[PDB]
């Protein structure tokens, strides 16, 4: 059932496993994500950006999600607001019906970002709503990164125990080296473990990591063979996102991933058959590669089975 | 707001006009109908075939269009079974929330069709949502106006699709198009009820063209002339089904954006140009059919 975000990373956290965040934009992504969570018996994040509330409308979003869980009550299902960039936009989620926000204030000086935050939290958990803040900026630590301005870029842990003290936010994504995308990684993919483990020994709290798309080589394959342009990516590797829960990583950010296995399908039909205009002979195909890379990650991430 | 199928094509035939109908499989289609709707203040059809409920769950079908129809109040919208086949089926619908209904036992004996035909018009009848039913072949072979006047007069149904030359799909002329427009008020003046008419892509020039320019192939595709639709609606047609010229005009967009930029792979940029040229063939049919400018 639509459940509070907490419940089920409290859960994860205290168990020691990640949760899967799957990001959708329409009916499509939203079904395939669902149908992956029933049947690997997982807990599931879905999750819209504003730009994809902007696309559907809020009440869409909100509408499609609460059907989806009418059609399958018995898997936990929290609906997140992903990167939400005002309060007023993480208020506008809460009305609506959505069980979990982020409110992203990461860019502003720590002060800013701890009020904005403590704001938005005072006014979901009102509503029982739980809340998603981040620390540090979601870029590369390129090589030859100065030994300081990286403590300028990825989370500062002191900062984070601060952080969450003061605001009481439920859960916390400390950017530790990964970034939004297809290319995470010029050369070889490197991530701030100590620093991620030095986090939550000082907070204690549910963790989030983003940019967690890993570019699986079956993923990236189908898309190249379709004809698709995927040079310089790199995500980050299957291992690293196991040792990222280890860590204490408990909810995993994946879009990228679903979108390059669905547009591979969408792709390849185009391809093959000129006559082709049946939407879902374009659609089914691409759900169900979509489907299966989020059954391989809710394997990975240790939630198969948690329900 | 969701109306029975019968307020909207019992006014479309007393004021002469035809409404379209069109289908839908997921959200950017439908979002692109409504838009249309809106943008020319007219009236809707939406259909879901049996194939594109299995496809969404008929759950997600009736509630995606609930919500859009809270999104737009002001626009009169049934909700619509098209080409059930079975008793069961056109239950179900009626069940989840549907307004309207066809029930298709055309390929059976005029008998059998119009026994089935009547078993479901009592049930929806009795829920409050409209039936459609249908005689002939849709490709003697056409719809015979004297079986059409029993049919409607004993089974009660709210509209009839009468078989006059059309058929599904892009490729619906072999040579040059040719309707039954005599067969057509001849049922029309027998019947007396709204009329309705599948197979009414019209495969427009722009659209074909943003296909084949997309690397589609469309060869030896023909659909019903605008002039004819607009003949169509005059001889007494109220409901037109169009689905194909949606598909191609969406396709089209979807194929383009995945010639011209191998990286993309944000689904919004496939399916915002697919809606727009959705929403726009379904703009001009409602200019072309007179629904336009109804609400
Ligand atoms: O951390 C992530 C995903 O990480 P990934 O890119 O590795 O999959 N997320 O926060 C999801 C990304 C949201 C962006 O979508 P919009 O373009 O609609 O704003
Ligand atoms: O009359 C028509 C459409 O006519 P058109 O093909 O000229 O647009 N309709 O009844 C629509 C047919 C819908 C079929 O879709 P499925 O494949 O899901 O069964
Ligand atoms: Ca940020
Ligand atoms: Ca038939
Ligand atoms: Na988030
Ligand atoms: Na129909
Ligand atoms: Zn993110
Ligand atoms: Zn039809």
Same mark, same amino acid.
């Given at each position: 059932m639509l459940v509070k975000g907490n419940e089920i990373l409290l859960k994860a956290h205290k168990e020691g496993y990640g949760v899967g965040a799957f990001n959708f934009v329409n009916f499509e992504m939203l079904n395939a994500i669902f149908e992956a969570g029933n049947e690997e018996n997982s807990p599931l994040f879905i999750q819209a950006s504003e730009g994809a509330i902007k696309y559907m409308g809020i009440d869409m979003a909100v509408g499609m999600v609460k059907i989806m869980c009418?059609?399958?009550?018995?898997?936990?299902?929290?609906?997140?607001?992903?990167?939400?960039?005002?309060?007023?936009?993480?208020?506008?989620?809460?009305?609506?019906?959505?069980?979990?926000?982020?409110?992203?204030?990461?860019?502003?000086?720590?002060?800013?970002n701890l009020e904005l935050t403590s704001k938005v939290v005072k006014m979901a958990h009102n509503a029982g709503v739980s809340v998603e803040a981040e620390l540090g900026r979601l870029? +590369?630590?390129?090589?030859?990164?100065?030994?300081?301005? !990286?403590?300028?870029?990825?989370?500062?842990?002191?900062?984070?125990?601060?952080?969450?003290?003061?605001?009481?936010?439920?859960?916390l994504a400390?950017?530790?080296?990964?970034?939004?995308?297809?290319?995470?990684?010029? +050369?070889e993919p490197k991530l701030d473990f100590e620093r991620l483990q030095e986090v939550k020994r000082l907070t204690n709290i549910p963790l989030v990591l983003h940019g967690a798309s890993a570019i699986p080589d079956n993923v990236r394959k189908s898309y190249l063979d379709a004809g698709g342009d995927l040079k310089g990516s790199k995500g980050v590797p299957?291992?690293?996102?196991?040792?990222?829960?280890? +860590? +204490?990583?408990? !909810?995993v950010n994946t879009d990228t991933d679903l979108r390059i296995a669905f547009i591979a399908e969408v792709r390849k039909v185009a391809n093959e058959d000129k006559s082709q205009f049946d939407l879902r002979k374009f659609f089914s195909p691409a759900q169900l590669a979509l489907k299966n890379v989020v059954k391989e990650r809710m394997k990975l991430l240790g939630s198969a089975n948690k329900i």
């Open positions: 009418e059609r399958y009550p018995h898997i936990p299902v929290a609906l997140h607001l992903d990167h939400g960039t005002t309060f007023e936009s993480c208020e506008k989620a809460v009305k609506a019906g959505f069980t979990s926000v982020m409110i992203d204030a990461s860019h502003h000086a720590f002060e800013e870029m +590369g630590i390129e090589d030859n990164i100065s030994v300081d301005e !990286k403590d300028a870029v990825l989370v500062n842990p002191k900062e984070a125990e601060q952080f969450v003290k003061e605001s009481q936010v439920d859960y400390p950017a530790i080296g990964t970034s939004h995308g297809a290319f995470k990684f010029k +050369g299957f291992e690293f996102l196991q040792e990222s829960v280890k +860590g +204490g990583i408990n !909810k």
